[PDB]
Symmetry: D2
Subunit: 145 residues, 4 copies
Amino acid sequence: HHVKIAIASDHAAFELKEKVKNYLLGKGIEVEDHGTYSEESVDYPDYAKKVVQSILSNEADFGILLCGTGLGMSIAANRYRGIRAALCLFPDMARLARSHNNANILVLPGRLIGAELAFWIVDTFLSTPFDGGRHERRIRKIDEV
Amino acid sequence: HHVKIAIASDHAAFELKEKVKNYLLGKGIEVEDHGTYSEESVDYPDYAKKVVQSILSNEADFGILLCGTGLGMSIAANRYRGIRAALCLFPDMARLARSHNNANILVLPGRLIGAELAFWIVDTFLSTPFDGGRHERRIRKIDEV
Amino acid sequence: HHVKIAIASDHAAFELKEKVKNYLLGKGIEVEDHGTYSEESVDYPDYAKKVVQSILSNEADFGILLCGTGLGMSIAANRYRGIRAALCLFPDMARLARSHNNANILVLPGRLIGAELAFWIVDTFLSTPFDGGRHERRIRKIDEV
Amino acid sequence: HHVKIAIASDHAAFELKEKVKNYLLGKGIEVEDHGTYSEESVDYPDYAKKVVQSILSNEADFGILLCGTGLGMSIAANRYRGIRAALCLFPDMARLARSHNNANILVLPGRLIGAELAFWIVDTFLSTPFDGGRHERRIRKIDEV
């Protein structure tokens, strides 16, 4: 449980964000919730930036970003060198995001998946090591922009 | 059929890339294939950059990028301002990628989905307009990095 | 809105069942809720049978069955000749379930999908006609046991 | 590798059926291929029955059935008492199909999923034990028709 998560969502994925946060808190995982804090309409990139800043500053180990489909977050967060944000719809995607892409942000679709599936994806994401190997060159090439 | 597509993949998604290319060619859609041109091992970011350059230079209207899971491509392509690359696993995701995110690159997982599903995703992506509206602010915010 | 739905779930998919029911009711669609009526533990086949009976007696036009993954319901309901229960995880599956399989029961996974995705699947299921054609022989063969 | 699989598909899922068969054969798993043996048009229920008969006669340990979407096979095979055929689109579904439903037939969508994903689903299906417990009552209730 000694892993620190920075989490954020827009209004469309607020409900799932809350469930994921509470799931983590229930395991004694340290969670910083960057919002949003209601279902009033907000813009996803504002929230991507808060989690990004926390990862780039080494203030959290992993990020979790959520919007309706995950697409907006997957686009906004990956604007930043050093960020590898992975939109995962089932656990094997999270496994590979970690194993192959050394992903540091998990992106979830708040209107598309169920909470219990989200929890399995989160557990896989947080418990899978990076394989290194031939993947390392590829991850470095992402940031050779 | 007057739409121009720039397509690329790594070796893991070469087979699906070829099928998608041929599907497009069979409809009389202009396709520029940036490679890779075999199953010999290559690095996905090298191929993301070729499609990106083509979109940013207004040499193609839409990009299609493929790797094993789509994750590497979704990360690498979204490093670039002006690029909105959307990892879509089923047609409604492509619909929303266009409607809400004005996506200009479709990312597909070459080992995860079937060809006929990929074709439906592609058809949806290429035939859905951007809604504009309140989405426009969000897409602009992505590039306010 | 002149379509009558018989719906049921076990305890694991109670929450989604309620959301789907209320979604339908909000469109003025007639819904008969066969339960379950809480999250206390129950057995999915008991609920499959209630919706099945309603379809076979021509008391409802379509059924909707839900459990955690959809698997139990897809197995239990398809024990009955005349029932074509289709486990659909995204809208194109519901489209084909109707177009090709003339499905009369939609099965949804209550822990795996999000409510808004479920609503799109339901809308597709209820609004897609059967194509007939060469599919008719296949549907008849299902019941030649 | 001492597990015997009976496999069958219609024409729409012939390609994936062949890949799955060869994957199994490459691990030294005994596979009986009930067809179909080309892409000429056939009717899925004819093939469901062949695998079903093999499972009910204790001539194979597990079945694998494939059609375009999996829906036809999931309906046709589950007509038979003693058969628990599970349409699985990702590995966790196969895990639960085994753990909770003691599934004896895996159903795969031949046009919807990629081969490497199918292989992961198959590996999970064949390597997961039934949990028993409170699931046993439910599986018995399926056959109390």
